Design a protein around this ligand. Structure first.
Ligand SMILES: Cc1cc2nc3c(=O)[nH]c(=O)nc-3n(C[C@H](O)[C@H](O)[C@H](O)COP(=O)(O)OP(=O)(O)OC[C@H]3O[C@@H](n4cnc5c(N)ncnc54)[C@H](O)[C@@H]3O)c2cc1C
Ligand SMILES: Nc1nc2c(c(=O)[nH]1)N[C@H]1C(S)=C(S)[C@@H](COP(=O)(O)O)O[C@H]1N2
Ligand code: MOS
Ligand code: MOS
Ligand code: FES
Ligand code: FES
Ligand code: FES
Ligand code: FES
Lengths: 164, 334, 755, 151, 51, 164
């Protein structure tokens, strides 16, 4: 007697006929859909390794809205009629990299690479809300993303090129 | 080290389209949904009415909006809630309403929406009306990340009732009004010391749900600060965080009202009631500074073995934060 | 020729796109199971029962594994003093008792939580002081001594003695520990995919537990999402468990740790306690030093001895000290065994050094830079362990950092700020470092490579080193390309595996570029010698032409290369022999503003000058300086682990453990690599960069201490030569408490106080 | 490896002919250690590149030689440790070699000499040697059906 | 030294037990697909269409 | 609407709740149960690489009967209440070889090894019906097993040891 859960991932419709309320979006992406760009870093919202963009038509604002979220804490059961964009949704080396992906790589903003998808999606989400952000908006976009390798300097430098 | 002149330019019109199929589905009228798992049944409520009935029918059913607290409880604290209701779709719990006395936010409103709304209020309105709003914004400044703030609800933080909630001390100090409902019942209360009776508990009935929260405009001769400790070492204790309010008799520096509310000094958000009561009718001067600090030192004193340690540091912060408030009020009084 | 060019990390584009595969991204076999560790909740206790009755009721539950299930040996760990699975007694919170296997990671988690253990507590030893008081140590005292201490202390004008503590550190690699084990069902064969810096020990340890020859076990490492030393040995805690599950079930099995498991179980940096006494002249010149070090090693030896050895090697930092005695003791405690962490005892001993050096300058009433400079080694001096400093570049780093950071002008601005401000203060400090390069165990200083040239001219390089984000494969491709005189596009490195290069040392000690660089270079030289006759015959032909002709002439296009670092072997008995191949040097200047009322602070500006010789890749090497400095900034100022009095870790995730964040880094953050300083001793004149810069993070700590001194001058007393103790990490708690004023003393209340 | 176990890889594949068996027998003889200490897991292009197909009946001949040569290199490298510990075991000699930072990994290679037949000149060796044999068979045929029995 | 001795094929015991792994005996990944060749039914022809 | 299919493989109960009539025992063993000792050599009954033993109680004969079958042609839907034995059911190098397995291996009757499980299952079945067979019975047991490597001599020679 369960309703089907319907959401989108990278533009593609997902119809889940047996949604478990306990299932996190991160588990679903990694272990059901096989999209493993989105990572587990902590499972408690602190690290941003699992960051994705969520998009929905907000019926109260009469508007399509885009925001970032931690996949590790998002229950799939909150996502009926929501669209998910992961790192694989915005570009790849087999097609064309998104400018966000190109600049973090070329600026030496990726060392081990594990935090890179989460940071890419935080920056992506900002640009989708504000195509011409200021330098300050850029720094604040990453309060939820941790990087242990780089010391952050190169990531900010490469992304500062999106500012004005 | 790299050459930005060679980067691909950004083309904002060439982004992945919002799924047209999804857009077509937005016309479909919302209805209650039921999901069934190994251990949990989840009901997505489409209407406030549905929510109140479900809660009357199942008073133990757990509400979830952002899951930023329930997800932790389930994963790390071993908690299991066999029935969950998600009210996120309900318009009443998402409404942002401008009234005579303040700005009301539905309880499912994300902290990002609150921050946006308040930032707009602060840019538009006279400084003198936005003292509490700015207190709220200061607490939201270095609070999590964009990811958490976009899904964490205002009501979720309040009802979670962590001793170290950075928002509850501000809401208590400002007597922020809470509209609380069940099937039949509707009541509004300003948040005060009694709203948090014990650890992780609030003054709600088993069926009741928090509907909306009204954050007050400040009045003439009314000033507000909020501060927080910049370290956290234990899961939900021993991080000092406060809301501080003073109202003066018209055009004076004579205390008419005073509220100093603290997180991280006990197993709940508390008000330094005994200390503040003693300052009524007193003037905003060195003597008041000395008496408040003495009151705070006593009323909030921590046993050497208090949970969370940092005993001296925390006492010192309670006082140092009041000192900052004291000086800030002096600057504001001109 | 890309050597010396800022070539991006080879995998950076794939990492940005989420295409780069880490261990848990590997697809699951149709029948693959999942393992979750079951772990002690007591610091020290007898295990009285393990009840799996409720765990067996969890959907998808397969089995519970314990010591009884092991076919080979339950004895493991670097010094064979650990259990795979604890049998009768647990000796730390987090000590591994067993594991659950289930059909999904969610089900493994559920079952593990419901396993019930009954204990009988035993007296526990948690703190270093517990351990000293109880005589609870691993092994006997380590010591280096030179000169005559009694004489030195007799000639001293001033003597300062004290005690200092430095807290430990969690690696917080963004990817936690992870193993996949695939049992083949033939002959005990098993293939493992592991996030490890040490495929050799993984292979050996799995082999020992199973009781099968090492040649049956294949360990493959594509890449790690960070290692930082925490995957040098402690990765085997997970690997061996998962190999057991694979052996027992006959199914592929994997485990990736959740953050809270990882922080509890796998060990961190060693906390250190130091008791020190320095004798010095009124000029600031050091004439005698005595330091007793104690490390908190936890519940097994692991790498604790070698870490203390490195600490003693670095107790001088950059200072010539004629009469010196350093000792070290490893404290045996009921905590998870601590392990390698970037720096490996060096940062601890260097921090202890800089602390007493800060006190010398204060006592003498002299500017700190001047005391540091006056005490600095000169080119060709011997260290306290009698190794000659050749190409000692600190003076150059110092002068250039002083100039480019505008130290003296900014010092005057800091003073102006402190004069004008009552409740905020600035501090500024400039700090040098040297870091010895090589494993202090001579036999680990060996490296292999294996190179094949295929008939299309494409080249596959394999070497004993692993990639953990440091750009080692990138540098090896740049080296191979330069050596062979072909473009990098022709070379590929796929992974590190025990069946291509055997018996590899852990990717550690910052020497990987050095030693794998030579091994790759040598293999390349062999290929060149074999191709030379074909180039001679066809000098205007292409690489591809030469390769095909060699193939058609039946000349082998595959070879090993090997390198053994020469002239290494320090003796603690003679205090002679080279402990290191050379030293990496650097200097950092940092400025901070503290909030004396709250204990918060802002990192305002940091300038670093680093001697990395002739960099193979300036972008990668600058990246290593920046990352290592920020980890050191974390160690000394942000990161704090906290335990219950019963020895249970409280700080088990990013909510309670604060690594540096985007907003944590110095507002102005400048790094320069020193110019025209080739290193004769390593590959293409480069120097090791991995670990040497991390201690430069302490420049922030000592700027914070400078700022506290100013706050104390403002509010506490009038004693300009006061020494107060500031332990590491200097968190807001320690900073606030050190700013003694009317609030800390409660003088503001009307009571009298020390204000 | 440091336990004294040996992993052999060569360009030849196993298809039932017992090539790996023979290569282990060769390695055991050349190293002077029991067959139980040696293992062949698989054939792979990342261990031995540019291999000829396992074909022409020469795999034992040619991989046997490559294995032999690699073994000889190992023995040469172990010899100083044997001399220092003459009453010791294989395992002790390997561990001593490891701790003295002597490489315990090596390639081996063989190229069959003096082959090069020319169809132009009808000269030059086409083969290294020849394998010979003789068979005698008896059959019974059924002249009425075309069936037969191999006797 | 076993050279010249009738040592059984090293894998023979595992071949008799069904434990020796041949290509198709390798376990399938969860996402593993299967290919089947489509081949000419004519000895010599133009390909006009494929439906 | 569909009945359960219940059978046994190597002593263990198999309950197939959704049996497809087209499913062969060979496909079931290999690709559902993961018992890959039984091999595909032809799919047409002619090579015996897929040989297994089936056991059932004969109501008419009033006893348990054991016979060999080609798993490539046995519909699982014929197997309700039948017990299957494969090569992994009789012995293993991890525990102990069955004498049939030991003898074929030691007699040099296995070269590539692909036909070996089928021949083991043919010989095992014979022995389960006749613990002391004749040389004649032994060769006849194999009319349905092909081996391309050995020339058969060593296999018969090794199994001769079980006669008469
Ligand atoms: C990484 C991270 C950092 C954080 N940092 C801070 C911080 O610095 N300061 C701070 O104060 N907090 C912090 N939080 C806490 C965060 O603000 C709260 O977790 C969040 O607001 C809870 O809202 P939610 O919608 O996710 O609640 P949920 O997890 O869905 O529910 C929370 C609780 O509220 C109840 N509930 C929710 N809505 C209602 C309703 N309207 N009526 C009755 N009961 C209701 C639920 O039953 C549940 O008990 C942090 C959280 C994370 C994950
Ligand atoms: N991105 C990244 N950089 C890193 C590490 C890491 O795990 N990730 N580990 C450090 C440590 S502890 C060491 S010892 C060196 C090891 O690699 P190398 O010898 O190739 O420098 O890298 C350092 N830099
Ligand atoms: O030598 Mo780095 O792994 S501590
Ligand atoms: O050379 Mo045999 O494979 S015809
Ligand atoms: S995994 Fe760390 S925030 Fe989600
Ligand atoms: S690149 Fe390694 S965590 Fe960011
Ligand atoms: S596969 Fe050949 S008889 Fe079954
Ligand atoms: S052994 Fe190869 S087909 Fe029989």
């Amino acid at each position: 007697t369960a309703d089907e859960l319907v959401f989108f991932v990278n533009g593609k419709k997902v119809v889940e006929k047996n949604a478990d309320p306990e299932t996190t979006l991160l588990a679903y992406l990694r272990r059901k859909l096989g999209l493993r760009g989105t990572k587990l870093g902590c499972g408690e919202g602190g690290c941003g390794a699992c960051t994705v963009m969520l998009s929905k038509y907000d019926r109260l604002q009469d508007k399509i809205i885009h925001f970032s979220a931690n996949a590790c804490l998002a229950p799939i059961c909150t996502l009926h009629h929501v669209a998910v964009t992961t790192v694989e949704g915005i570009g790849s080396t087999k097609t064309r990299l998104h400018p966000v992906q190109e600049r973090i790589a070329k600026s030496h903003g990726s060392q081990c690479g594990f935090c890179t998808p989460g940071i890419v999606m935080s920056m992506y989400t900002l640009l989708r809300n504000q195509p011409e952000p200021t330098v300050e908006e850029i720094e604040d976009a990453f309060q939820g993303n941790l990087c242990r390798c780089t010391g952050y300097r190169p990531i900010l430098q490469g992304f500062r090129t999106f500012a004005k | 080290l790299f050459n930005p002149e060679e980067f691909m330019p950004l083309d904002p019109t060439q982004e992945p389209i919002f799924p047209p199929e999804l857009l077509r589905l937005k016309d479909v009228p919302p209805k209650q949904l039921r999901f069934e798992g190994e251990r949990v049944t989840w009901i997505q409520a489409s209407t406030l009415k549905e929510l109140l009935d479900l809660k009357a029918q199942h008073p133990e059913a757990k509400l979830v909006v952002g899951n930023t607290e329930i997800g932790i409880e389930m994963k790390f604290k071993n908690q299991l809630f066999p029935m969950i209701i998600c009210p996120a779709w309900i318009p009443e719990l998402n409404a942002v309403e401008h009234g005579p006395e303040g700005i009301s936010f539905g309880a499912a409103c994300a902290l990002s929406s609150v921050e946006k709304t308040l930032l707009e209020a602060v840019a538009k309105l006279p400084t003198q009306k936005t003292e509490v709003f700015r207190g709220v914004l200061e607490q939201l400044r270095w609070f999590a990340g964009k990811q958490v703030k976009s899904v964490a609800s205002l009501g979720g933080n309040i009802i979670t009732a962590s001793p170290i909630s950075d928002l509850n001390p501000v809401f208590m100090a400002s007597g922020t009004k809470l509209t609380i409902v069940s099937r039949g019942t509707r009541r509004t209360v300003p948040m005060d010391h009694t709203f948090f009776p014990s650890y992780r508990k609030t003054l709600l009935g088993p069926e009741e749900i928090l509907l909306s929260i009204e954050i007050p405009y400040s009045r003439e001769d009314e000033f507000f600060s909020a501060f927080k400790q910049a370290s956290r070492r234990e899961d939900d204790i021993a991080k000092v965080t406060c809301g501080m309010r003073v109202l003066f008799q018209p055009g004076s520096m004579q205390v008419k009202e005073l509220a100093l509310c603290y997180g991280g000094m006990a197993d709940r958000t508390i008000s330094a009631l005994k200390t503040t009561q003693k300052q009524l009718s007193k003037f905003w001067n060195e003597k008041l500074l000395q008496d408040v600090c003495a009151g705070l030192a006593e009323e909030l004193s921590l046993s050497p073995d208090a949970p969370g340690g940092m005993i001296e540091f925390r006492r010192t912060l309670t006082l140092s934060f009041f000192f900052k408030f004291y000086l800030t009020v002096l600057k504001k009084l001109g | 020729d890309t050597v010396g060019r800022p070539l991006p990390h080879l995998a950076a584009a794939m990492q940005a796109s989420g295409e780069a595969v880490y261990c848990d991204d590997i697809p699951r076999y149709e029948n693959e199971l999942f393992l979750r560790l079951v772990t002690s909740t007591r610091a020290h206790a007898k295990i009285k029962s393990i009840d799996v009755s409720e765990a067996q009721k969890v959907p998808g539950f397969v089995c519970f594994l314990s010591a009884d299930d092991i076919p080979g040996s339950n004895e493991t760990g670097l010094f064979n003093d650990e259990t795979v699975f604890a049998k009768d007694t647990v000796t730390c919170v987090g000590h591994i008792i067993g594991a659950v296997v289930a059909d999904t990671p969610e089900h493994a988690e559920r079952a593990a939580h419901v396993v019930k253990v009954t204990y009988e507590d035993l007296p526990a030893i948690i703190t270093i002081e517990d351990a000293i008081k109880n005589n609870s140590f691993y092994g006997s005292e380590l010591k280096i001594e030179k000169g005559d201490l009694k004489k030195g202390f007799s000639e001293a004008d001033n003597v300062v003695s004290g005690e200092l503590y430095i807290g430990g550190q969690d690696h917080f690699y963004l990817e936690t520990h992870c193993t996949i084990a695939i049992p083949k069902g033939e002959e005990g064969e098993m293939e493992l995919f592991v996030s490890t810096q040490n495929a050799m020990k993984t292979q050996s340890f799995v082999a020992k537990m199973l009781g099968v020859p090492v040649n049956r076990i294949l360990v493959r490492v594509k890449r790690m999402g960070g290692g930082f030393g925490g995957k040098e040995t402690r990765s085997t805690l997970v690997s061996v468990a998962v190999a057991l599950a694979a052996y027992k079930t006959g199914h592929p099995v994997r485990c990736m740790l959740d953050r809270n498991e990882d922080m509890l179980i796998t060990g961190g940096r060693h906390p250190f306690l130091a008791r020190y006494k320095v004798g010095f002249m009124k000029t600031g010149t050091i004439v005698a030093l005595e330091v007793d070090h104690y490390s908190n090693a936890g519940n097994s030896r692991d790498l604790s001895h070698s870490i203390m050895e490195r600490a003693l090697f670095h107790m001088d930092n950059c200072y010539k000290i004629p009469n010196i005695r350093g000792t070290g003791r490893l404290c045996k405690t009921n905590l998870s065994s601590n392990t390698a962490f970037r720096g490996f005892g060096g940062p601890q001993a260097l921090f202890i050094a800089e602390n007493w050096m800060s006190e010398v300058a204060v006592t003498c009433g002299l500017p700190a830079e001047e005391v540091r400079w006056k005490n600095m080694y000169k080119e060709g001096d011997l260290t306290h362990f009698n190794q000659r400093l050749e190409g000692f570049s600190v003076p150059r780093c110092w002068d250039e950092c002083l100039k480019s950071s505008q130290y003296y002008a900014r010092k005057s601005e800091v003073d102006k700020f402190n004069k004008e401000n009552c409740w905020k203060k600035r501090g500024l400090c400039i700090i040098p470092t040297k870091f010895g390069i090589s494993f202090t165990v001579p036999f680990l200083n060996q490296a292999g490579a294996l190179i094949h040239v295929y008939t299309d001219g494409s080249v596959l390089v394999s070497h004993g080193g692993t990639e953990m984000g440091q750009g080692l494969h990138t540098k090896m491709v740049q080296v191979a390309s330069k050596a062979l005189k072909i473009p990098i596009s022709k070379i590929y490195i796929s992974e590190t595996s025990t069946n291509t290069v055997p018996n590899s040392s852990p990717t550690a000690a910052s020497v990987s570029t050095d030693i794998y660089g030579q091994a790759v270079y040598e293999a390349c030289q062999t290929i060149l010698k074999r191709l030379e006759p074909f180039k001679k015959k066809n000098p205007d032909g292409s690489w591809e032409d030469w390769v095909m002709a060699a193939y058609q002439d039946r000349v082998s296009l595959s070879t090993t290369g090997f390198y053994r670092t020469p002239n290494l072997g320090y003796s603690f008995e003679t205090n002679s022999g080279n402990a290191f191949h050379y030293f990496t040097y650097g200097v950092a200047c940092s400025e901070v503003e503290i909030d004396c009322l709250t204990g918060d602070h802002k990192n305002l500006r940091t300038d670093i000058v680093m001697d990395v010789g002739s960099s193979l890749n300036p972008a990668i090497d600058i990246g290593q300086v920046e990352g290592a400095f920020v980890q050191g900034l974390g160690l000394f100022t942000l990161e704090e682990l906290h335990y219950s009095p019963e020895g249970s870790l409280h700080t088990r995730g990013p909510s309670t453990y604060k690594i540096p964040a985007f907003g944590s880094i110095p507002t102005e953050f400048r790094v320069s690599l020193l110019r025209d300083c080739p290193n004769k001793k390593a590959i293409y004149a480069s120097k090791a960069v991995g670990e040497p810069p991390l201690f430069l993070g302490a420049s922030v700590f000592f700027a914070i201490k400078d700022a506290i001194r100013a706050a104390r001058a403002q509010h506490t007393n009038n004693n300009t030569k006061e020494l107060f103790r500031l332990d590491s990490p200097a968190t807001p708690e320690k900073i606030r408490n050190a700013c003694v004023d009317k609030f800390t003393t409660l003088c503001v209340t009307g009571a009298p106080g020390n204000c």
